[PDB]
Amino acid sequence: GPKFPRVKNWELGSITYDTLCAQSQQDGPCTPRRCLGSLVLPRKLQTRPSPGPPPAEQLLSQARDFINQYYSSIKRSGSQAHEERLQEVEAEVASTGTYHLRESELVFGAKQAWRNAPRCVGRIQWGKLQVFDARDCSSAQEMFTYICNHIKYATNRGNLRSAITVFPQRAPGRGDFRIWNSQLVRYAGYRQQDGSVRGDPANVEITELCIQHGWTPGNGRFDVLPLLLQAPDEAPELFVLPPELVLEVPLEHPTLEWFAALGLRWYALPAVSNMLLEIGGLEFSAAPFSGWYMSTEIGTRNLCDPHRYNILEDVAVCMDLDTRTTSSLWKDKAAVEINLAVLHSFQLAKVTIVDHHAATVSFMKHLDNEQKARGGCPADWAWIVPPISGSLTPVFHQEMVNYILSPAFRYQPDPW
Amino acid sequence: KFPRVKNWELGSITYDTLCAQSQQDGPCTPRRCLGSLVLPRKLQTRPSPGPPPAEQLLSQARDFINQYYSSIKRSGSQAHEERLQEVEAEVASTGTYHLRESELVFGAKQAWRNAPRCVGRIQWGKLQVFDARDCSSAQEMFTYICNHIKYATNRGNLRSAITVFPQRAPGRGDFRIWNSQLVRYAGYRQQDGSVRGDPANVEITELCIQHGWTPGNGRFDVLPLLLQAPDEAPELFVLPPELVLEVPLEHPTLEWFAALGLRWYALPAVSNMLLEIGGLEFSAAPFSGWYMSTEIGTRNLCDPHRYNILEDVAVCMDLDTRTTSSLWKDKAAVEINLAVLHSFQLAKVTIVDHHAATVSFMKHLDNEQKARGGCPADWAWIVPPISGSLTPVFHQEMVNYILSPAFRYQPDPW
Numbered sequence: 001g002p003k004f005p006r007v008k009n010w011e012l013g014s015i016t017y018d019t020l021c022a023q024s025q026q027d028g029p030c031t032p033r034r035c036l037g038s039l040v041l042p043r044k045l046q047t048r049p050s051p052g053p054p055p056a057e058q059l060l061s062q063a064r065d066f067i068n069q070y071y072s073s074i075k076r077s078g079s080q081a082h083e084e085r086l087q088e089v090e091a092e093v094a095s096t097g098t099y100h101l102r103e104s105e106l107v108f109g110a111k112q113a114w115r116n117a118p119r120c121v122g123r124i125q126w127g128k129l130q131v132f133d134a135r136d137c138s139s140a141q142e143m144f145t146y147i148c149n150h151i152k153y154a155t156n157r158g159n160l161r162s163a164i165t166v167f168p169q170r171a172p173g174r175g176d177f178r179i180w181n182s183q184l185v186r187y188a189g190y191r192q193q194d195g196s197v198r199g200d201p202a203n204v205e206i207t208e209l210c211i212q213h214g215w216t217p218g219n220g221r222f223d224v225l226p227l228l229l230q231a232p233d234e235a236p237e238l239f240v241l242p243p244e245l246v247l248e249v250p251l252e253h254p255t256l257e258w259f260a261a262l263g264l265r266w267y268a269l270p271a272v273s274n275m276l277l278e279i280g281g282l283e284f285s286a287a288p289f290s291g292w293y294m295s296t297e298i299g300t301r302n303l304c305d306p307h308r309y310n311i312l313e314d315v316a317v318c319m320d321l322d323t324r325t326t327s328s329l330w331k332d333k334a335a336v337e338i339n340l341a342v343l344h345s346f347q348l349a350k351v352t353i354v355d356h357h358a359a360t361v362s363f364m365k366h367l368d369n370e371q372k373a374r375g376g377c378p379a380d381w382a383w384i385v386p387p388i389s390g391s392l393t394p395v396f397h398q399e400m401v402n403y404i405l406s407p408a409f410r411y412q413p414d415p416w
Numbered sequence: 417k418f419p420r421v422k423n424w425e426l427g428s429i430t431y432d433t434l435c436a437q438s439q440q441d442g443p444c445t446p447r448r449c450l451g452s453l454v455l456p457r458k459l460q461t462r463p464s465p466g467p468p469p470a471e472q473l474l475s476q477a478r479d480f481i482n483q484y485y486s487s488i489k490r491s492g493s494q495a496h497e498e499r500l501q502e503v504e505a506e507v508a509s510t511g512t513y514h515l516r517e518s519e520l521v522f523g524a525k526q527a528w529r530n531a532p533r534c535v536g537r538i539q540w541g542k543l544q545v546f547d548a549r550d551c552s553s554a555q556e557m558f559t560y561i562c563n564h565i566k567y568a569t570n571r572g573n574l575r576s577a578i579t580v581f582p583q584r585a586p587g588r589g590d591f592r593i594w595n596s597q598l599v600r601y602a603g604y605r606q607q608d609g610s611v612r613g614d615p616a617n618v619e620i621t622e623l624c625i626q627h628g629w630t631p632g633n634g635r636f637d638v639l640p641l642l643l644q645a646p647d648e649a650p651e652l653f654v655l656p657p658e659l660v661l662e663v664p665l666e667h668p669t670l671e672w673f674a675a676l677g678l679r680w681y682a683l684p685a686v687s688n689m690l691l692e693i694g695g696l697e698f699s700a701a702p703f704s705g706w707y708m709s710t711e712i713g714t715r716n717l718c719d720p721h722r723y724n725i726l727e728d729v730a731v732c733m734d735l736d737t738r739t740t741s742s743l744w745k746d747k748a749a750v751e752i753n754l755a756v757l758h759s760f761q762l763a764k765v766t767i768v769d770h771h772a773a774t775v776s777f778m779k780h781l782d783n784e785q786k787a788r789g790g791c792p793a794d795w796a797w798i799v800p801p802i803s804g805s806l807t808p809v810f811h812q813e814m815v816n817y818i819l820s821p822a823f824r825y826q827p828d829p830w
């Protein structure tokens with residue numbers, strides 16, 4: 001049969017072959033000897049800081065490959081304009097050590113990066129992305145203006161629009177542009193005396209960093225953190241987001257009237273801000289991107305993880321379930337209502353959100369589209385399958401091939 | 417070369433050094449991960465018409481023998497050196513060799529222990545091993561299988577067991593159990609392609625009919641076994657109904673659930689996998705333990721390509737099946753799993769829920785970290801099909817690799 005990975009969907013019995021992986025130019029963490037596909041951060045892509053300028057030879061091949069992707073995408077591969085652009089990139093690297101992207105090339109790359117993200121289940125929206133070019137930004141204060149505009153446009157009063165803001169690329173032996181927070185909107189995590197945590201345990205470090213840098217802490221469970229923005233070779237500066245710009249949703253349950261009394265809530269905009277956007281060898285250390293939430297992110301992970309808000313027991317006690325024995329499935333029941341609450345509240349508030357059923361179904365359509373357009377789609381099964389009701393969704397029954405394609409969104413070391 | 421393994425719920429870290437002992441290749445490569453694939457594209461168990469390369473076989477045999485003697489703290493003993501010489505002598509002259517019962521017992525347990533997709537390995541040391549290598553006919557296989565079933569079921573107090581039939585031999589056909597499990601519900605293709613019964617057993621149901629079985633017409637008709645002795649057409653045997661314990665499903669508070677006429681068998685006994693110990697291959701070695709509720713309540717009854725009872729239960733619950741956002745599927749799935757647990761508990765039949773099961777697996781990982789420096793595990797299979805992140809294993813990174821002794825998949829005999 002075909003010399004490529006055979007992929008099967010066990011619900012439908014259909015078969016496809018992934019030929020796109022043949023295009024991967026970067027190795028992942030697995031080997032014939034052992035699979036490391038379940039590791040969150042194996043030492044692979046990891047964009048560790050490589051200060052001193054990169055091998056001109058290394059950068060050039062990556063740049064040539066990307067330009068080739070660009071001209072292919074506009075169907076002008078082999079054309080005079082293609083060969084001229086290639087010549088220009090080569091000359092520019094040959095004299096300055098690096099190069100720069102045209103406006104339309106950046107837009108294309110940003111979208112491809114999303115398209116290539118193995119861990120994103122909402123890629124069926126990949127072609128619709130608002131790319132804000134902020135490569136002219138020259139100060140931490142300006143970074144804050146850019147970011148506030150991003151939030152304003154993306155939040156769009158509840159009718160969320162996908163967007164990305166791209167700040168200046170990393171440059172020859174110079175400081176990077178960095179957003180210290182993992183997300184534009186994060187709730188504080190206060191370490192208590194007895195060692196417990198008030199707020200979100202996931203943000204204890206960044207919370208303490210904001211304090212060390214002059215932020216006057218609050219003492220609530222849902223205090224929105226300020227941003228620590230860093231311009232080249234400067235210490236980070238602190239910026240507080242205007243309350244009116246951070247849209248939140250109080251959580252209530254459609255039938256359990258007491259749930260609202262829990263005083264739980266979540267923000268509307270999921271904007272990742274600590275990932276590195278790599279295009280043609282070029283590295284954009286600060287390129288925050290946002291879309292909209294899939295309910296399980298909030299309802300299952302953020303609110304129910306043992307190491308996060310951990311509200312499962314509280315909600316079970318309220319629905320007066322038997323939390324003394326596992327077989328009563330009290331965890332499963334509470335989790336379902338909590339997710340239902342998230343969906344209901346977002347709908348009430350007219351804020352964009354998608355449930356794990358709709359989300360996965362659409363991702364299946366995306367897989368079908370991509371099979372035809374590229375011959376495959378890199379996907380991380382453990383991340384694509386929802387944290388609750390796994391086999392009740394179609395993706396659970398779909399084998400997936402994971403691999404690295406560029407452009408890409410990579411993880412990078414914390415700047416501190 | 418040793419992978420750092422992290423648990424994101426606790427922050428703890430360990431290093432898997434056991435994977436270095438893997439001598440068999442998986443489906444992954446540095447260019448792409450195929451960890452989510454169910455079956456191997458090549459890691460199969462190709463035919464055995466010829467003798468396995470003596471060099472290859474001997475090395476695997478010595479490895480195993482070494483493992484065995486280490487297990488009884490008699491490494492480098494007189495017995496150890498002599499057993500190795502016997503093995504070498506037998507292979508050199510016959511091209512194969514045979515295991516001593518105690519070694520077979522040790523190999524079976526290690527095979528279970530190394531099964532990456534098994535979440536119940538904390539029970540790996542408690543396994544009743546029935547030696548059936550003295551089998552020469554299908555009829556004899558049926559008697560062995562019947563005894564295995566009576567022992568394992570034990571009136572509802574399930575006990576893990578495995579029966580090992582004669583190893584494969586060069587140029588001679590394999591002993592095989594055609595059925596994937598000793599207990600399976602028939603799947604009858606009716607009208608417009610719809611299926612009455614279990615859709616997963618359409619093919620085997622069809623084979624049984626072709627070989628003389630007079631089919632039923634129900635949704636839970638226990639199938640007969642098609643047992644095959646070397647180079648002979650398979651034979652048909654009907655299991656004494658008294659031997660097949662079943663559990664009628666009812667719900668603790670939902671009165672009408674019982675009216676759905678649902679039920680499931682107590683004994684999960686896989687019968688189509690191959691047991692490989694020290695290079696030797698046992699094509700027929702059925703093994704059984706007990707069910708983890710999700711296998712029945714989520715996969716078997718709710719898979720769209722299985723009994724697919726989700727909408728029916730939802731409608732009975734009067735849920736809004738008009739939209740996905742009402743989470744009607746999630747809600748019905750939880751009650752169905754509840755019904756399974758309640759029912760099995762009521763009938764006094766062993767079963768373990770997915771929370772209790774995964775917690776014990778975590779303890780197993782630790783026991784193994786200390787005992788062997790690691791534990792091969794398939795994350796996708798270990799994490800339950802519902803409430804994934806609600807269990808501890810979801811937050812546990814895992815390293816997957818092939819260790820021997822081992823249970824492997826093999827071609828269907830037809």
Ligand code: HEM
Nearest residue numbers: 114117119120121122125162163289290291292293294409
């Ligand atoms: C339009 C709606 C979108 C939805 C519903 C969506 C949903 C998701 C979900 C469920 C995750 C996993 C989150 C987690 O478990 O922490 C995720 C990951 C990711 N998404 Fe999307 N996504 C969307 C838009 C975007 C956009 C606009 C981009 C980029 C332009 C993007 C890039 C990624 C990447 C790189 C990851 C991996 C993050 C990580 O590794 O931590 N997504 N997305």
Ligand code: HEM
Nearest residue numbers: 528531533534535536539576577703704705706707708823
């Ligand atoms: C004592 C109770 C046991 C429990 C609770 C248990 C549970 C499980 C579960 C949930 C699976 C996945 C099944 C599926 O989704 O199809 C599984 C797979 C497996 N178990 Fe166990 N198990 C137990 C005993 C055993 C025993 C006695 C052996 C063998 C000696 C064993 C060998 C395996 C193997 C080889 C697999 C993978 C089978 C496949 O690839 O289809 N298990 N087990």
Ligand SMILES: C[C@H](O)[C@H](O)[C@H]1CNc2nc(N)[nH]c(=O)c2N1
Nearest residue numbers: 038039040382383810811812813
């Ligand atoms: C250990 C395991 O890889 C880890 O908990 C993964 C599993 N799947 C996930 N899936 C998503 N979407 N997000 C995550 O953070 C994770 N964490």
Ligand SMILES: C[C@H](O)[C@H](O)[C@H]1CNc2nc(N)[nH]c(=O)c2N1
Nearest residue numbers: 396397398399452453454796797
């Ligand atoms: C395609 C995917 O690998 C497949 O559906 C797997 C996922 N996890 C599983 N986990 C268990 N326990 N059993 C299964 O059959 C599967 N099927």
Ligand SMILES: NC(=[NH2+])n1cncn1
Nearest residue numbers: 270289290291292293
């Ligand atoms: N849901 C999510 N985690 N994200 C959406 N856009 C960027 N991340």
Ligand SMILES: NC(=[NH2+])n1cncn1
Nearest residue numbers: 684704705706707708
């Ligand atoms: N629960 C299960 N799937 N099994 C137990 N023993 C063999 N299979």
Ligand SMILES: [Zn+2]
Nearest residue numbers: 030035444449
């Ligand atoms: Zn892998």
